[PDB]
Ligand binder design. Structure first.
Ligand SMILES: N[C@@H](CCC(=O)O)C(=O)O
Lengths: 276, 271
């Protein structure tokens, strides 16, 4: 009943904060979450730092822990991010579940076919997929837009990219070979860097997870950045569990239970809705 | 060895038409010339009929993908399925799946807690929710409008009997007032309620947005009342010990990811 659970920071679903030096206890709506930090780069020596976590998914974990009746030891992944298969080996949150270092992974984890082959996913609890962010007024149909499909067919080519190594890049790689090969030049280290490139005119479009992009558009200063239309390859975030896990059954019923009772809408207005 | 598929009439996911004199389905094509795939589906009026649409194209894809043969029939009592006290029992497609009359449910079947306790749902093949259908001109705010929260015989509203919507309003104690009002007006099928709205016999129909949005796009005398609530999805239904459940879900995921699901949407909905 005491489970090792892995997560990853990505506002507003999971937000990390430093713990109080004088108390060493998490307060408010936060829960304890540790992170393994290296001492140097010449050794494997490291130490777990005690931090605090909050957000949409943390509230979901709290609800689940209570209703499903289990306790946990939440930790932040340090070997990769959400999950990528490299040389046939999974890293990130997915990897932590696959190699059994965690009973489940909770966070902004996108459910897709290749991941579902190595881990079990609960029903989706947050609707997402692939969206496109651009400055208001930009004319683009969606992913299938020729500006994306055949970039060099336009004088100044359209400049667009994603944050590599996630479900979004994996999808583009499999569906649009030319677009993907062209995009790498515009890879963004993260969402924050991407938004800055957009606002300053260094990028024309940013392709990424729909739920995060809608959240970002909802709080954009001046409401200049918006999502086009639309969601391609609709899916959702899901809790990843070990294949054949005994926890899946109760977890699914509880999540569906929350949706029907409106608990998901409350969390939605509490963490996701913005001024724009 | 041939899978028994049960479905239900519900445009644009499942259209149902009579076969031709010779017992076959009339050859039809989309606006631009693609062949409309049809399957012979038996059902009550028991006689052979023609079935096609979003869900039928999905079945054909799943069957070819997982390499299985099937036979399709329309649910005998014409309902989606709810659990009623008699001991409790399931009716509609839920009952047929649980009794062995069907091996798989392929329709716009809402995934919910109540049903998930007894059967296995695939990952959603369609994400949507509930909205309200009214006659153009009817002024309603949403599920929070006073005409709904503080009912009277002056403004009648309802949903479909033995449906996921019925389960939803009967489950939420805060919707008790609406539930009691609807219990006296619910229709046997979505088609009938929709027709009642056009004939001013029903003032508001609470149903799936995927269906109502489509109806509003085909009949300009009908419109949807803003604000989607009870966001939910449709999934394939199977018994918990079905050996096809893992591959069925993997196939749904694959279809969303490679654009197949979007093609069905362009073909049957967004048109
Ligand atoms: N939610 C994504 C990360 C962001 C993206 O690639 O869209 C994943 O689980 O990989």
């Amino acid at each position: 009943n005491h489970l090792s659970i892995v997560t990853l920071e990505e506002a507003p679903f999971v937000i990390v904060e430093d713990i109080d030096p004088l108390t060493e206890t998490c307060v408010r709506n936060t829960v304890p979450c540790r992170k393994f930090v290296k001492i140097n780069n010449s050794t494997n020596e490291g130490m777990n730092v005690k931090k605090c976590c909050k957000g949409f998914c943390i509230d979901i974990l709290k609800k689940l822990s209570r209703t499903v009746k289990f306790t946990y030891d939440l930790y932040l992944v340090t070997n990769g991010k959400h999950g990528k298969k490299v040389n046939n080996v999974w890293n990130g949150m997915i990897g932590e579940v696959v190699y059994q270092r965690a009973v489940m992974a909770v966070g902004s984890l996108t459910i897709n076919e290749e991941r579902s082959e190595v881990v079990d996913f609960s029903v989706p609890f947050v609707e997402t997929g692939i969206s496109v962010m651009v400055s208001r007024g930009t004319q683009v149909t969606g992913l299938s837009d020729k500006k994306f499909q055949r970039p060099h067919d336009y004088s100044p080519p359209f400049r667009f990219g994603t944050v590599p190594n996630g479900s979004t890049e994996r999808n583009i790689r499999n569906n649009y070979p030319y677009m993907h090969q062209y995009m790498t030049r515009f890879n963004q280290r993260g969402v924050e860097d991407a938004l800055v490139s957009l606002k300053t005119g260094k990028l024309d479009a940013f392709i990424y997870d729909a739920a995060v992009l809608n959240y970002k558009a909802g709080r954009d200063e001046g409401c200049k950045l918006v999502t086009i239309g639309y969601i391609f390859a609709t899916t959702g975030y899901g809790i990843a569990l070990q294949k054949g896990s005994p926890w899946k059954r109760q977890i699914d019923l509880a999540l569906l239970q929350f949706v029907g009772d409106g608990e998901m809408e409350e969390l939605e207005t509490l963490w996701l809705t913005g001024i724009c | 060895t041939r899978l028994k598929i049960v479905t239900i009439h519900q445009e644009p996911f499942v259209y149902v038409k009579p076969t031709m004199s010779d017992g076959t389905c009339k050859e039809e094509f989309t606006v631009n010339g693609d062949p409309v795939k049809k399957v012979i589906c038996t059902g009550p009026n028991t006689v052979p009929q023609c079935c096609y649409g979003f869900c039928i194209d999905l079945l054909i894809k799943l069957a070819r993908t997982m390499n299985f043969t099937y036979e399709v029939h329309l649910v005998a009592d014409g309902k989606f399925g709810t659990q009623e006290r008699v001991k409790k029992e399931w009716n509609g497609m839920m009952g047929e799946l649980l009794s062995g009359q069907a091996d798989m449910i392929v329709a716009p079947l809402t995934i919910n807690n109540e049903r998930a306790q007894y059967i296995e749902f695939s990952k959603p093949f369609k994400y949507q929710g509930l909205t309200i259908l009214v006659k153009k001109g009817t002024r309603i705010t949403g599920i929070n409008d006073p005409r709904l929260r503080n009912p009277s015989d002056k403004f009648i509203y309802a949903t479909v009997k033995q449906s996921s919507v019925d389960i939803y309003f009967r489950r939420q104690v805060e919707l008790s007032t609406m539930y009691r009002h609807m219990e006296k007006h619910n229709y046997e099928s979505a088609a009938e309620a929709i027709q009642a709205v056009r004939d001013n016999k029903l003032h508001a129909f609470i149903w799936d947005s995927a269906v109502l949005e489509f109806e509003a796009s085909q009949k300009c005398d009908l419109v949807t009342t803003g604000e989607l609530f009870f966001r939910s999805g449709f999934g394939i239904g199977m018994r918990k010990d079905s050996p096809w459940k893992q591959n069925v879900s993997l196939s749904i995921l694959k279809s969303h990811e490679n654009g197949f699901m979007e093609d069905l949407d362009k073909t049957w909905v967004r048109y």
